[PDB]
Amino acid sequence: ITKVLIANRGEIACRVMRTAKKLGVQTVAVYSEADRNSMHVDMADEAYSIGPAPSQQSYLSMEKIIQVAKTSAAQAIHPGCGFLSENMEFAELCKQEGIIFIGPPPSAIRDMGIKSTSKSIMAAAG
Amino acid sequence: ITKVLIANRGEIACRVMRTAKKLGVQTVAVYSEADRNSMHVDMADEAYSIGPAPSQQSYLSMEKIIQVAKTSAAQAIHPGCGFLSENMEFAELCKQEGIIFIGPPPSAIRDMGIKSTSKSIMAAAGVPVVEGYHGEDQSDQCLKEHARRIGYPVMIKAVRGGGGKGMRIVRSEQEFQEQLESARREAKKSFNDDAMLIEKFVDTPRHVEVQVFGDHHGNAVYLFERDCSVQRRHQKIIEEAPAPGIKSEVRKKLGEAAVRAAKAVNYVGAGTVEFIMDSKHNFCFMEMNTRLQVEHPVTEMITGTDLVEWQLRIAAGEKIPLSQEEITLQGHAFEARIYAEDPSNNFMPVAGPLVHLSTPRADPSTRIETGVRQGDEVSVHYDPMIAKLVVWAADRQAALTKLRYSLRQYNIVGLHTNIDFLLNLSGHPEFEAGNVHTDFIPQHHKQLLLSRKAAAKESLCQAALGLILKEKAMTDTFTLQAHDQFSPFSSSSGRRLNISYTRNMTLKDGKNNVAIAVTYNHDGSYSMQIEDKTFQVLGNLYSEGDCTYLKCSVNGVASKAKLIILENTIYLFSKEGSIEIDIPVPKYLSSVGPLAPMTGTIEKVFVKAGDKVKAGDSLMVMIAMKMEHTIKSPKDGTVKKVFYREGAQANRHTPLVEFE
Numbered sequence: 122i123t124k125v126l127i128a129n130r131g132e133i134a135c136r137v138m139r140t141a142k143k144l145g146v147q148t149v150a151v152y153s154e155a156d157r158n159s160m161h162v163d164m165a166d167e168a169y170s171i172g173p174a175p176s177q178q179s180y181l182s183m184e185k186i187i188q189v190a191k192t193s194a195a196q197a198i199h200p201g202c203g204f205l206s207e208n209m210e211f212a213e214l215c216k217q218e219g220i221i222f223i224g225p226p227p228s229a230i231r232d233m234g235i236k237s238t239s240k241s242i243m244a245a246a247g
Numbered sequence: 248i249t250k251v252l253i254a255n256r257g258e259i260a261c262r263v264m265r266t267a268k269k270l271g272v273q274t275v276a277v278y279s280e281a282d283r284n285s286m287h288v289d290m291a292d293e294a295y296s297i298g299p300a301p302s303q304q305s306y307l308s309m310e311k312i313i314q315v316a317k318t319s320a321a322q323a324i325h326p327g328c329g330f331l332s333e334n335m336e337f338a339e340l341c342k343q344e345g346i347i348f349i350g351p352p353p354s355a356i357r358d359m360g361i362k363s364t365s366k367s368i369m370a371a372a373g374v375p376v377v378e379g380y381h382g383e384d385q386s387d388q389c390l391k392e393h394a395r396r397i398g399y400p401v402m403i404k405a406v407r408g409g410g411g412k413g414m415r416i417v418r419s420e421q422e423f424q425e426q427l428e429s430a431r432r433e434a435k436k437s438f439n440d441d442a443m444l445i446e447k448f449v450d451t452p453r454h455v456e457v458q459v460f461g462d463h464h465g466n467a468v469y470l471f472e473r474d475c476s477v478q479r480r481h482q483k484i485i486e487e488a489p490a491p492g493i494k495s496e497v498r499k500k501l502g503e504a505a506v507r508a509a510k511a512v513n514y515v516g517a518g519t520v521e522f523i524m525d526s527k528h529n530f531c532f533m534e535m536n537t538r539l540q541v542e543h544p545v546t547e548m549i550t551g552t553d554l555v556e557w558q559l560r561i562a563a564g565e566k567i568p569l570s571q572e573e574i575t576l577q578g579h580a581f582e583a584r585i586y587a588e589d590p591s592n593n594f595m596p597v598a599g600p601l602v603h604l605s606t607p608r609a610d611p612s613t614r615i616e617t618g619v620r621q622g623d624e625v626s627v628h629y630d631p632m633i634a635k636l637v638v639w640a641a642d643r644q645a646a647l648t649k650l651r652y653s654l655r656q657y658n659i660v661g662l663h664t665n666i667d668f669l670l671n672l673s674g675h676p677e678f679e680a681g682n683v684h685t686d687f688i689p690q691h692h693k694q695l696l697l698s699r700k701a702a703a704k705e706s707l708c709q710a711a712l713g714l715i716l717k718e719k720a721m722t723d724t725f726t727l728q729a730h731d732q733f734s735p736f737s738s739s740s741g742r743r744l745n746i747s748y749t750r751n752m753t754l755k756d757g758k759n760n761v762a763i764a765v766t767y768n769h770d771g772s773y774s775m776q777i778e779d780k781t782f783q784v785l786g787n788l789y790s791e792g793d794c795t796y797l798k799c800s801v802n803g804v805a806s807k808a809k810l811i812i813l814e815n816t817i818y819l820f821s822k823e824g825s826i827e828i829d830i831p832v833p834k835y836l837s838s839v840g841p842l843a844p845m846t847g848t849i850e851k852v853f854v855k856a857g858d859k860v861k862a863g864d865s866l867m868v869m870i871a872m873k874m875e876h877t878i879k880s881p882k883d884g885t886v887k888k889v890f891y892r893e894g895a896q897a898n899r900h901t902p903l904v905e906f907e
Contacts, residue, residue, distance in 0.1 A: 123648055143610075145640070145649035147822055152805075162805060166822050170803035 122146055122197045122221065127161075128186045129201030134161035137199055149193045151186065153179035167193060180204040183211050190220050197221035209234070248272055248323045248347065248563050253287075254312045255327030257618035258635060259541055260287035263325055266555040275319045277312065279305035281628055286618055293319060300628050306330040309337050316346050323347035323562055325539075329630070332538040335360070349562045351516045351537050358512060359537055365512060369532060372511035374504055377523070377531040383442035387430070391423060393445055402446045405438040413437045416449075448525050451684035452476075455490050455522045455530065457501045458546065459509035460554070462561040467509055468571040469502035470550050472522075473542065477672070479688045480594065484665075485672060488545040488580035491643055492681060497528050502571070508532060517543070517558050541635075544614060548580035548639040579646040580639045583654055583673070587631040589663040590696055596631040600624045602661035603811055605794055607653035612639040625662065633659065643681075647673060658820045660811055667825075671695045702756045702826050704777045705801050708784045710754055710817045710828040711763050711775060713797045713810040715739075716788050741767030754817075755829040840882050840906055843897045847871025852893045854904070859885045867891075867903055882906060 124147040127134050138148040138161065150165040155174035162168050169189045172178040179185070181204050190198055198220055200206040209230040215222040224230075233239050250273040253260050264274040264287065276291040281300035288294050295315045298304040305311070307330050316324055324346055326332040335356040341348040350356075359365050363381070370376045378397070383406065385393055394401050394417060401417035403426075413434035415426050435441065457472035474487040490498075505520035517539040522530040543554050552569065560568060588594045604621040607613060614637040625631055638653060640646035651673055657666060672678065672695055678687065688695065702710075719739040726737045741748040750765045766774040773784040786799040788810070797810035797819070809820040817828045849869045854860060860880050867878040887907035891897050 144645060145652035147652075165805070166807070168805045 122223075124149065124193070124195050125197045125199050125223070126150070126186070126190045126193060126195040127165075127199045127201060128180060128205055129199070129203070130156050130159060130161060130180065133201040135164055137201065138164050149189065149195055151179065151189055155179070169193070176204065183208070183214060186211075187214060187218055187220070191218070195220065197223050199223045248349075248559055250275065250319070250321050251323045251325050251349070251559070252276070252312070252316045252319060252321040253291075253325045253327060254306060254331055255325070255329070256282050256285060256287060256306065256629065258616050258632065259327040261290055261618060262544070262616060263327065263555055264290050266553065266559075270556060270559070272559070275315065275321055277305065277315055281305070281626055285623065286620055295319070300626070302330065302628060309334070309340060312337075313340060313344055313346070317344070321346065323349050323559075325349045328538055328541050347562055349516075349558060350539070351514055351518065355512055355514050356537055359535060362534070365535060366532075369508045369511045369535075372507050374508045374511065374532050375530060377446070377533055379445055379447070381444065385443060385445065386441065387423075387427065390426070390445070394420075397445070397447055400448055402449050403443050404446070405434075405440060406442040406444055407440060408438045410437070415443075451526065451686065453492075453524050453684055455493075455501070455524055456519050456542070457505045457522065458517065458519050458543070458554075459505045459514065460517050460557060460567060461509055461515045462567050463515055463564065464566050466567045467506045468567055468569070468574065469505050470546055470552065470554075470574055471498060471576050472501050473546060474683060475521075475542070476683050476685045477678075477687055478685065483542075484584060484688070485669065486542060486545050486582045487643075487683075488549045488582075489576060489578075491579070492683070493528065497530075498576075501530060504530070504532070506571075508535065515561070517554050542582070544616065544635070544637050545580050545582040548612075548614065548637060549576060549578055550574055551577070578639055578641050579643045580637060581646050581650045581673075582635055582637045583650060583669045584632060585634045585636065585657065585659075585669070586665050587625040587633055587662055588665050590665055590668045591663075594665070596627075597662055598625045598627045598631065599662040601633070601659060602813055603658060605656070605658040605809070606634070607636065607656035613649070613653055614638070633664070644679070647679060652822075655820075655822060655824075658809060658811070658818075658825075660813055660818055667697075668695055671697060699757055701759075702828060704780060705782065705804075706819065706826050707754055707756065707761055707763060707777055707828065708775050708782045708801050709786075709797065709799050709806070709808060709819055710826075711752060711765060712773065712784050712786050712799060713812065713817060713819070714752075714830070715750075715765070715773070716786070716797065717810075717812055720788065740771070742769070753831055755831050760831065840902065840904055841866065841878050841880065843869065843878075843899060843901045843903060844876045845871035845874075846896070846898045847874075847876065848896050849891055849893050850875070852889060852891075854886050854889065856886055856888060869897060878903060 125141060126149045127137055128151060134150055141148045148165045150161050150168040151171055152159060152162045152168050153171050153174055156162060171182065171185045186198065198215060205211045209227050212222045212224065212230055213227045232242065251267060252275045253263055254277060260276055267274045274291045276287050276294040277297055278285060278288045278294050279297050279300055282288060297308065297311045312324065324341060331337045335353050338348045338350065338356055339353045358368065366376050380393060399417065399420050403415040405413065415429050417426065453474060453476040455472050456475050458470040459467060460470065461467040472490045474490040475483055477485050501522060508520050509518060519536040519540055520532065521534045523533050524530045539554065539558055547554060557568065587598065588596050601619060601621060601623060604619065606615045606617065609615065617634040619633045636654060636657065638646055638649045640649050651670060654666065654669060675691065677691065722737065722739050726732065748767045751762060752765065753760050753762050761777060764776045768774060775782045775784050782801050784801050786797060789796055789798060795810050797808055799806045806821065811818040815830045815832060817830065819826045847869045849867060851868045853865050853867060862880050862883050864880045865877055866880060869876050884906045886904050888905045891903060
């Protein structure tokens with residue numbers, strides 16, 4: 122991973138980018154209309170806008186984040202926490218598009234959605 | 248050693264002095280007339296001049312360096328690299344004078360001058376040298392026996408001579424009929440000698456260098472070997488510290504073999520034993536270096552040692568502070584050497600001023616060693632190197648990413664360098680995979696020197712914005728000196744009454760001109776139309792230390808690049824490359840036939856038709872009431888007619904010569 126897109130904002134976006142800079146990895150972020158002058162916009166090497174301030178139009182969007190990853194030539198996407206971090210369809214979309222999803226594979230995410238499914242899988246393991 | 252004289256300049260002089268200051272040792276340096284304002288003069292506690300700029304009169308002199316050591320009361324001399332570092336007579340002179348030579352004793356230097364002498368001394372100790380034969384007894388029948396003894400692959404070269412002709416290659420046993428044909432067809436017409444020597448392989452060799460450090464008490468340790476295979480014109484360009492591509496057993500074997508070699512020649516100090524390998528780890532000794540080398544900081548990153556401190560301690564009579572079982576191996580380190588040179592003509596060195604110098608961010612894992620400050624010039628009398636960038640990371644791939652990431656932050660403006668070559672050399676699919684051998688660069692040479700590419704329209708928007716904001720800066724610093732402060736007109740807003748203002752500027756991208764129409768918007772944004780496409784361009788300037796950065800937002804895409812504007816050229820340094828956009832120069836700033844000054848007679852004509860003069864040339868001399876007037880040429884070209892021959896009377900404002 123030479124360039125990572127961080128599909129998140131604020132404290133978590135800055136925490137990851139500081140590590141990336143330390144390692145030598147380029148960072149791209151997104152900022153909606155709402156975070157145009159937030160902390161992670163200036164810390165990033167490049168960032169793209171998406172749309173209206175509510176999260177439904179900016180950070181929870183599946184297509185907009187991929188579109189940013191493709192045009193910036195990002196090799197991996199880090200969802201951080203709270204937006205797409207538990208979105209199994211997004212992890213599957215990244216795989217099909219060819220982008221590294223930083224997180225568990227879709228097969229490990231989907232089976233954890235139902236509490237009774239993970240209870241039985243783990244109980245059978247001791 | 249309480250005071251050391253360093254008989255060297257530049258990067259190596261500063262590297263040693265920083266350690267000395269850390270230890271508490273006073274440093275003296277020498278600077279010739281050439282380095283009066285170089286980096287190591289100010290870092291030193293005291294420094295002396297010697298003489299004329301060429302090295303023969305300053306750093307290679309034996310007596311001048313001793314004279315400096317005596318008057319400064321230095322206790323030891325460190326030769327560094329390249330001048331007296333291999334001068335055995337100087338080491339003997341120091342001993343006789345009473346000054347500590349920091350390096351091996353003369354007895355260890357002299358026996359290493361002759362390659363056959365060190366080969367025998369080390370071979371007798373169990374060192375795997377390149378064997379072969381150096382005898383003339385290798386005729387056709389003997390050659391068959393010699394090839395069987397060393398193995399069927401053979402490269403045959405003359406005892407005397409070369410040039411790339413007359414050589415014979417054996418890649419199998421049943422090729423001696425071809426060897427006999429070639430020996431008669433061409434080989435003996437150019438060499439004019441029957442005697443030729445044999446070696447084993449020439450197929451993708453690698454140079455692997457393992458360090459040896461010994462002391463005056465009989466101890467020796469080894470530090471982990473480097474891969475030094477990547478070179479062009481027999482000059483090392485980059486270097487890999489942990490020598491990737493080998494196993495831990497190879498590292499142990501090279502450690503023991505190099506210590507046996509260093510003891511065989513009774514070597515003391517920090518030296519290096521150079522091995523050559525094939526693809527199957529058959530290492531053979533070729534040569535040994537007897538000085539503390541400039542390559543060492545790339546290894547220190549992965550061993551965790553300080554070899555300059557170690558060398559000073561054993562020179563004072565101490566033991567090796569850290570044993571061979573305490574030397575670790577963590578991560579990978581790379582060096583990239585930045586030279587003042589122009590690769591477009593197959594690297595000829597260039598010399599000139601450095602107008603801007605910026606280094607990558609400091610970090611314990613990013614070691615920056617420079618010998619040139621901003622405002623300093625590159626000379627022609629000494630090595631054209633500017634800087635060495637050394638990085639460390641947890642593994643090989645992380646270090647290659649960090650090396651390229653930080654290298655693109657290194658900005659030189661004022662002369663041509665090899666930075667773009669280093670970036671294409673590291674960022675090459677085969678180099679990252681690990682396909683490294685001594686012919687890598689000539690094998691892929693055409694893929695490393697790439698032509699200039701056209702700028703994107705977004706990059707032209709950034710250049711136009713930087714220029715506009717620089718003009719604003721000039722306006723702002725004029726206002727700060729004005730009495731009429733806070734007033735309007737000072738804001739470079741382009742606010743016309745009831746209408747908008749569009750500025751039409753032209754930028755030159757390489758060879759081609761591009762017109763950019765910049766509309767000033769009421770909210771401070773710009774709308775820049777380049778050819779047909781409109782960009783919404785916002786941004787400003789900010790400072791970090793002594794560097795100016797341009798902050799851009801173009802169509803919602805934020806970016807940041809360093810903005811340097813030097814005379815006509817706009818430099819944009821970003822994390823994706825470096826783009827140079829030129830500002831065109833108008834005719835009336837770049838323009839800088841003739842008439843008679845009074846009514847006089849002409850003494851001497853100079854030129855006729857068919858001649859050519861260049862500007863500021865004597866065309867005519869005329870005397871007018873006893874005042875000799877020499878006409879000159881503001882114009883240029885070739886004369887078509889001279890209207891007045893010598894001795895004729897010319898009048899006021901009468902045309903003298905003509906250009907067709």
